[PDB]
Amino acid sequence: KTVDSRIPTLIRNGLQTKKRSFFVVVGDHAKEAIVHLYYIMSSMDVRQNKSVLWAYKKEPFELFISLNDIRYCYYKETDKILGNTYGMCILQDFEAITPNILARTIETVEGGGLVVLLLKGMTSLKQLYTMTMDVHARYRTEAHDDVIARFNERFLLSLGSCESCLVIDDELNVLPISGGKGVKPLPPPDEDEELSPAAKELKKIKDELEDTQPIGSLIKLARTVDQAKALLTFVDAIAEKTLRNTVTLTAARGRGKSAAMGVAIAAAVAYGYSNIFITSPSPENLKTLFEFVFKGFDALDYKDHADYTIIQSTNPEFNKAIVRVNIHRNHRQTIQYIRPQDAHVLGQAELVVIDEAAAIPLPLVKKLMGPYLVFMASTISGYEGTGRSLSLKLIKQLREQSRSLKEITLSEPIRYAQGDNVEKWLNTLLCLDPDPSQCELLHVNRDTLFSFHPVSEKFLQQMVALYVASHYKNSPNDLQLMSDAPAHELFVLTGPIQEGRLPEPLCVIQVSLEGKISKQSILKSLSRGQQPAGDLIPWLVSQQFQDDEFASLSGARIVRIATNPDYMSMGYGSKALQLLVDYYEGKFALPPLFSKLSERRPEKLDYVGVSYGLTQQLHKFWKRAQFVPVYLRQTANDLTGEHTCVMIRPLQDGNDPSWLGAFAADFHKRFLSLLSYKFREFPSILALTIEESANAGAMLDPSNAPTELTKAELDQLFTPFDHKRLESYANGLLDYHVVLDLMPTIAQLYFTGRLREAVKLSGLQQAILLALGLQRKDIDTLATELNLPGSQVLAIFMKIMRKVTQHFGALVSG
Amino acid sequence: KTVDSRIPTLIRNGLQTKKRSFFVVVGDHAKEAIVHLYYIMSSMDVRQNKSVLWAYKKEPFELFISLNDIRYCYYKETDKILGNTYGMCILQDFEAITPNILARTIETVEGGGLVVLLLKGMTSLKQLYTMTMDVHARYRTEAHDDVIARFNERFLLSLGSCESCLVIDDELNVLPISGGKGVKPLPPPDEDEELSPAAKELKKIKDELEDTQPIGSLIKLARTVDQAKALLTFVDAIAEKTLRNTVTLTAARGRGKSAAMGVAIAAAVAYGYSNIFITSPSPENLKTLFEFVFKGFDALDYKDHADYTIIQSTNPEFNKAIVRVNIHRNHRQTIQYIRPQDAHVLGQAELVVIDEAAAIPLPLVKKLMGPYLVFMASTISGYEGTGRSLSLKLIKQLREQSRSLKEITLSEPIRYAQGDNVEKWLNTLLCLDPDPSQCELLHVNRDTLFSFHPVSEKFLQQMVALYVASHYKNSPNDLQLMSDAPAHELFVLTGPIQEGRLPEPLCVIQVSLEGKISKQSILKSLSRGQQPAGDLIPWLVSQQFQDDEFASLSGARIVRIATNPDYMSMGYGSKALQLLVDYYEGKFALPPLFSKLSERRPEKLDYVGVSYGLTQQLHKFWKRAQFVPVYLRQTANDLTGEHTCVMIRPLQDGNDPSWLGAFAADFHKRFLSLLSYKFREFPSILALTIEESANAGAMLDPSNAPTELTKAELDQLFTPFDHKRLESYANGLLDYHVVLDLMPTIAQLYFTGRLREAVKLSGLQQAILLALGLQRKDIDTLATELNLPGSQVLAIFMKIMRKVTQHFGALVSG
Numbered sequence A, B: 001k002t003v004d005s006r007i008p009t010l011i012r013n014g015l016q017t018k019k020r021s022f023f024v025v026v027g028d029h030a031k032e033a034i035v036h037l038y039y040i041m042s043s044m045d046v047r048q049n050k051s052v053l054w055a056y057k058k059e060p061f062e063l064f065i066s067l068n069d070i071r072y073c074y075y076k077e078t079d080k081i082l083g084n085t086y087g088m089c090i091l092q093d094f095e096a097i098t099p100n101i102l103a104r105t106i107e108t109v110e111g112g113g114l115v116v117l118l119l120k121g122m123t124s125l126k127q128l129y130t131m132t133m134d135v136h137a138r139y140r141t142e143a144h145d146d147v148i149a150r151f152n153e154r155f156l157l158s159l160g161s162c163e164s165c166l167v168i169d170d171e172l173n174v175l176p177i178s179g180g181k182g183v184k185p186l187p188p189p190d191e192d193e194e195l196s197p198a199a200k201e202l203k204k205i206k207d208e209l210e211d212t213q214p215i216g217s218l219i220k221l222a223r224t225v226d227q228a229k230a231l232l233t234f235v236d237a238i239a240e241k242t243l244r245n246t247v248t249l250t251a252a253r254g255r256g257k258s259a260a261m262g263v264a265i266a267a268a269v270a271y272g273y274s275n276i277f278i279t280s281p282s283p284e285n286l287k288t289l290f291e292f293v294f295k296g297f298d299a300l301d302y303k304d305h306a307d308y309t310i311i312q313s314t315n316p317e318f319n320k321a322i323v324r325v326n327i328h329r330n331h332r333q334t335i336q337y338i339r340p341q342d343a344h345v346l347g348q349a350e351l352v353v354i355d356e357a358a359a360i361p362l363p364l365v366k367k368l369m370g371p372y373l374v375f376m377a378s379t380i381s382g383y384e385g386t387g388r389s390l391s392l393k394l395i396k397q398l399r400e401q402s403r404s405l406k407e408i409t410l411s412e413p414i415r416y417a418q419g420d421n422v423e424k425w426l427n428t429l430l431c432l433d434p435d436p437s438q439c440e441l442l443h444v445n446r447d448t449l450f451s452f453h454p455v456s457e458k459f460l461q462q463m464v465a466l467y468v469a470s471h472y473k474n475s476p477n478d479l480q481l482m483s484d485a486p487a488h489e490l491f492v493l494t495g496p497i498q499e500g501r502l503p504e505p506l507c508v509i510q511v512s513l514e515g516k517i518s519k520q521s522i523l524k525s526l527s528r529g530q531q532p533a534g535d536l537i538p539w540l541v542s543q544q545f546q547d548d549e550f551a552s553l554s555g556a557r558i559v560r561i562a563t564n565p566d567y568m569s570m571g572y573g574s575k576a577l578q579l580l581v582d583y584y585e586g587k588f589a590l591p592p593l594f595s596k597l598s599e600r601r602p603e604k605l606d607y608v609g610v611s612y613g614l615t616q617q618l619h620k621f622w623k624r625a626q627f628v629p630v631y632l633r634q635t636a637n638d639l640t641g642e643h644t645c646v647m648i649r650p651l652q653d654g655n656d657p658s659w660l661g662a663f664a665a666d667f668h669k670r671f672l673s674l675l676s677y678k679f680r681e682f683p684s685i686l687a688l689t690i691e692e693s694a695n696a697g698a699m700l701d702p703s704n705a706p707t708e709l710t711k712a713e714l715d716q717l718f719t720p721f722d723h724k725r726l727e728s729y730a731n732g733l734l735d736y737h738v739v740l741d742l743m744p745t746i747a748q749l750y751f752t753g754r755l756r757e758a759v760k761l762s763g764l765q766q767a768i769l770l771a772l773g774l775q776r777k778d779i780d781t782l783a784t785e786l787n788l789p790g791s792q793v794l795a796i797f798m799k800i801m802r803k804v805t806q807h808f809g810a811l812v813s814g
């Protein structure tokens, strides 16, 4: 009955220092352990006894659940507990706790609380090393069905590296694996006269401005010194009543940026501001901002339903998303929430607050800048953070624009004390925090990369920090995908290195093997709507082209490829791609972490393919490596604003590249017609490059060569009066509005190869002809895009039409 | 040397009563007459000696011009003197004074002034009856070259009907033609104690609110009692601080609506309003509104460059047009000018002022209404007024919408006393102020219609009041065009009437004869860019179709046709049109004003044509009368927002209607391709009706009948994989985004007649197919236009594609 003395000792130390505690329970009676832990935690303190959070998948204790406020949440509903604070968190089903769930469920516990994780009944702790998960179902494919678990090995291996983690059994017995069995009791403090220096500084900052309003009443809301300084900077910018200011605030997750900006909004309202606009990537990012706006209003003695009213958008799915707040104390004032694409409504703005400015595409932010006062906040680390390259681009653009720019930072968290052990363990576990010709490609073994060896861990952090430097929002589920995928392989590009020194990864490539689908399943899928969706390239070309022979081949999909942000644009990605291609072409004739390519026999593959969001810079890189386009989605992505593009390369050695020419020619014929449906927005050059690349890739089939245009076929397209109209226009005797129904036919004649060899056009003429004929654009829209006067775009368009007319006349007369 | 006593008597009476005087000078030394008149006018009064305005075309007096402020203006620059006030106006060149110039140059003279008109040296006053004008050059054509002047006859005949008009010679001698030779001197008044009742009422209204602010200081700006009441209503609406009000103000031209609204804007600014928006058809309508806004600011003790700043749009042509005003007294306030199509920026508005609301198309006004406070002003009579039908529609819609609506009116002018004689004469001269089967068409003689006989004048006013009832802005130049055109004819539709009673005009038709152009001139024009532009239908079809045989025919153009607004939609316009057509088909086997059709032999004409702005209601009326479309402009009209459409009917009796089938078929082939260029905006039904009408009119040529589609031609359009994709979509195994490049081909196949007889489609299916295939519209845009859910529009579109697929399969297999 005597409880081990280390449990209350650790709980008391956490309560004294205001830091969390981690407990892992193994057995079939975890209810008693949780009850005992809660009793021990509650019997020591009274200021920290908040609600208890419980998270699960689908499914004394009886008295315990009937005495405390328990919020029950599903693993899929964890987005609803955002912004709360709990005194205890419980996770029940170990089988389905993805890293995304784990990051969210733990950050909502204040200092001094308990984090309890429940494990199913076991006899030995080694059965988790390969236990099946609820996510492995999506991993399995027809070709590959055996999946080896590696995340759960690292999860138990990392428990011994935490100094605040205790692992106990049903009978409350400490286990050797626990990394906090050496904790000694802390000396009892005396705070009767002793006070922390930070507390004294905070009290002094609050007191020196008590006699001033409204800042004196508002400053009583801050909890950290950095929060107080950020509020001081915001209020100093606001009260200056000059709209030539900009403040950018960057910090980790949980430092207090949203609350600070919310209180600054109330200060701005109290200072006489009328037009206030708030933008964010998602309306779920403003939940605490709009709470602290109302907290500031309450601290300013405003009354509800008499001084302000709240307008809430009930109709869409986000019912709780506030959209508008009206204030009628002295004169009418409003606070409006808009989308980042609605920059045309900011003509009369006075204050625009951009929450999560790093996760917004840069041109949208560039268009949201005006001649007024701007507040920006961004996340640089922690869960859902932004890659360093995007942040560097954002701050570089802001510095280029400058108007006064002031940058501030926050360090100390709010819910728990700085230097918390559980936060450090979580950041570690999820990784949340030479001449090119001389480089060499290597294969990284995944059995030892996830073995928690110090060298392997040091390399894994470097690779993950490499491949997430361009994400808009860091996601820790890709770590589990990389670890537990059955067919994924990792390749790293290193320079010349010596023995005993780990090479620094210049580039990293992740590849997946796809293909080899039985024709019975392809026929079943092509005759119905169901699709396993295990693969991406086999299952898309078959549906788009209604073909049954492509999905039976073998190929590789490049899931991810990323180089060092400091080493970009110097030739390493191309070298790594070429080396991988040569490896798969048979050009090279505790296991060690690094294996040379010459020591392993490659696979026999027919093609290699990639899927990415279309951009000119990325398309040029992929086209230089001999990739040809096959697909281009019509609906743009909401998170970025780009269309998915698929490219395939026929890398097979000594085989006929004819099955790909048909696909390329079909795509080329579809793109010309589809330029009017949702591809009207594309810049002319971007569509021109895709058309040129598809036409060049369609030449892999010699039967796809174009044929000339004869007089007999021409007479079936243009009547003699059409010829007369074209001739009159070419001589300058007609307006260009008259000969405008003939543009699609001439464009289709030129861009399909019939007229290509007869008349030659430059790049600018090709772009103008493509736009006018296939995208149906106006002359004034063309003038803006090309940065040329409108009266000059027509001058070069009359030269396209007086070269075609001569050929038509020679063909008809001859 | 002794001046006639009637001149100073009339001048003194005008000065006493505050009314203008009209003088006409004939001779070669009008300088001395003008000098004497100015001296006589100035020697009596001192409070009215303002600047002298001089208007001319191209080209003691020496001392006279060097002592007074004279503003010299050109006849083409009369738009620059808008809003001013002068004490004397002079018109020099009688040869080019169009009615539009005459209306503008006279309204800017305050009461008590002089209006002097100069006439060239003459021996008899009868030479003006047929004197050539500077406008007659545009009237002459190749076919008709003799023009008879009639406006100058009426101008001299109406001078004798004015009681304030004197006609004098070089030696200052009164002429019998003068209509004010019987004026007797007025008794000398005594205003030492006597005051006008209106002046007493105005003083009382000003005084009873002196102690209140800011209305007490602002009310000192009004000049009439009606202006004061309008300002009181505006300020009462503003100070209520409830945004559920609307005030509509209607009056003649010169009553004080713009100034009243300008002062109300200053009151709103002083009452704490932040967002204020001003819209108008043209930025030249706000010249006095923005002047009185600044006058109110000055009366409110605001200081320039310290309390407000003015932002002016220098870059466009309208440099003087103010676009934005910023106020920073207590908190930032602004006043913005927007275009009527910019209703999307009014999300945060508090006061929207719509000047000249009748001249704006009704849907724009309907979209400018919001949940805020609206001020409207409109012109109902006088120069540049709006027809009564448009105003009735506007007020009926406003009453339907209602929110509180309050309507006010102004009667008494500002610059001159009410009951002015010159204003009455100007309004008179320029006309600024049964079963259908039993009706009969008549021809109106223009030699007696403009002879100033009382009966002829009474009928002319009734006709002009008929044909201007739908104009957005009344223009008095059309009166001169109707009077002096060499080939124009007027027809009126009257019911059964008795002798001695003038019939009431139910409908009026104006026709012009066009055609008969020598082929030499047509060849010269078609081989260059120059065009006489005398005709409209011959000179447009020849250029659009590059044809040389149409312009040599003979035809009639219906310039105007309008019925009684109270008798609309009851069958009179159709009856008049049919009777005119039968008259021109040879179906009928001081001169009197009315001539029966049976008494005159018609002309031999091949076609009849009309040009109008496209609308569904007008297109249906014209199509019912067997008219076929030939042209449709691509650029919309700025004043209305509609595209010009041309329709022609082959009315010739017993001739081949084959020259028109070619034009109709060419237009039908151009419209299908041009639906993507600027006709994407058209509603589906409106384009469908035009396509159906053009296809039906193209059948006048039997060689234009369509042919069936054969398997050989089908195999040259769709590959077997395209057939497989279409079949898969028809069975519900594909997304509609996949088979979307095939839509233009199917639409062109169906709407050109190849597939029309094989597969039958209803009206809704035809509209959806036309939109999706030829206009490239989205599904969500289609759902809004058709007032149907988006998920139901697709359900009926999958029925179009499973009828075409079966025919294609039968054609291929068979």
Ligand SMILES: CC(C)(COP(=O)(O)OP(=O)(O)OC[C@H]1O[C@@H](n2cnc3c(N)ncnc32)[C@@H](O)[C@@H]1OP(=O)(O)O)[C@@H](O)C(=O)NCCC(=O)NCCSCC(=O)Nc1ccn([C@@H]2O[C@H](CO)[C@H](O)[C@@H]2O)c(=O)n1
Binding pocket: A470, A471, A472, A558, A559, A560, A561, A562, A563, A567, A568, A569, A570, A571, A572, A573, A574, A575, A610, A611, A612, A613, A617, A618, A620, A621, A639, A640
């Ligand atoms: C290209 C690169 C790897 C090596 O390039 P290098 O450094 O090695 O440059 P190199 O010397 O070889 O040649 C010089 C030439 O490269 C060009 N170039 C030069 N600098 C840049 C630059 N900074 N950026 C771009 N191109 C550049 C060119 O400008 C220059 O032309 P030029 O000189 O010859 O003038 C390296 O740039 C890089 O990190 N690129 C970005 C990271 C990445 O992974 N790229 C490969 C992507 S595919 C797998 C993949 O992930 N697909 C996706 C993507 C999104 N999504 C969804 O979208 C959402 C998120 O978005 C959502 O989350 C979801 O994810 C998805 O589902 N699947």
Ligand SMILES: CC(C)(COP(=O)(O)OP(=O)(O)OC[C@H]1O[C@@H](n2cnc3c(N)ncnc32)[C@@H](O)[C@@H]1OP(=O)(O)O)[C@@H](O)C(=O)NCCC(=O)NCCSCC(=O)Nc1ccn([C@@H]2O[C@H](CO)[C@H](O)[C@@H]2O)c(=O)n1
Binding pocket: B470, B471, B472, B558, B559, B560, B561, B562, B563, B567, B568, B569, B570, B571, B572, B573, B574, B575, B610, B611, B612, B613, B617, B618, B620, B621, B639, B640
């Ligand atoms: C149609 C009408 C005469 C006789 O029609 P009826 O009274 O007779 O009606 P009816 O019994 O015969 O048959 C019933 C059928 O008529 C229809 N219908 C019934 N009510 C209405 C209605 N209220 N309006 C419309 N259609 C209606 C239908 O709805 C119904 O179909 P439904 O039942 O069988 O259901 C008589 O409506 C009317 O005033 N329409 C307007 C005045 C006018 O002149 N119209 C002829 C125009 S061409 C010459 C001309 O001027 N061209 C231009 C025009 C503009 N511009 C430039 O644009 C600027 C200005 O905009 C710029 O200033 C410049 O001017 C230009 O340069 N040259």
Ligand SMILES: Nc1ncnc2c1ncn2[C@@H]1O[C@H](COP(=O)(O)OP(=O)(O)O)[C@@H](O)[C@H]1O
Binding pocket: A083, A084, A085, A221, A222, A223, A252, A253, A254, A255, A256, A257, A258, A259, A288, A289, A379, A414, A415
């Ligand atoms: N001044 C404050 N007073 C009380 N609670 C606060 C204060 N500032 C932050 N918090 C709490 O701490 C959390 C901070 O999260 P937040 O600062 O919104 O994240 P981010 O760093 O992304 O802005 C909030 O959930 C809020 O409940």
Ligand SMILES: Nc1ncnc2c1ncn2[C@@H]1O[C@H](COP(=O)(O)OP(=O)(O)O)[C@@H](O)[C@H]1O
Binding pocket: B083, B084, B085, B221, B222, B223, B252, B253, B254, B255, B256, B257, B258, B259, B288, B289, B379, B414, B415
């Ligand atoms: N209260 C006033 N004080 C002085 N002048 C005025 C006043 N109201 C109007 N006016 C003069 O009379 C003219 C009235 O024209 P306006 O009222 O703008 O025409 P509308 O009737 O179309 O609004 C203006 O040119 C202005 O100079």
Ligand SMILES: [Mg+2]
Binding pocket: A257, A258, A355, A356, A377
């Ligand atoms: Mg935030």
Ligand SMILES: [Mg+2]
Binding pocket: B257, B258, B355, B356, B377
């Ligand atoms: Mg006006």
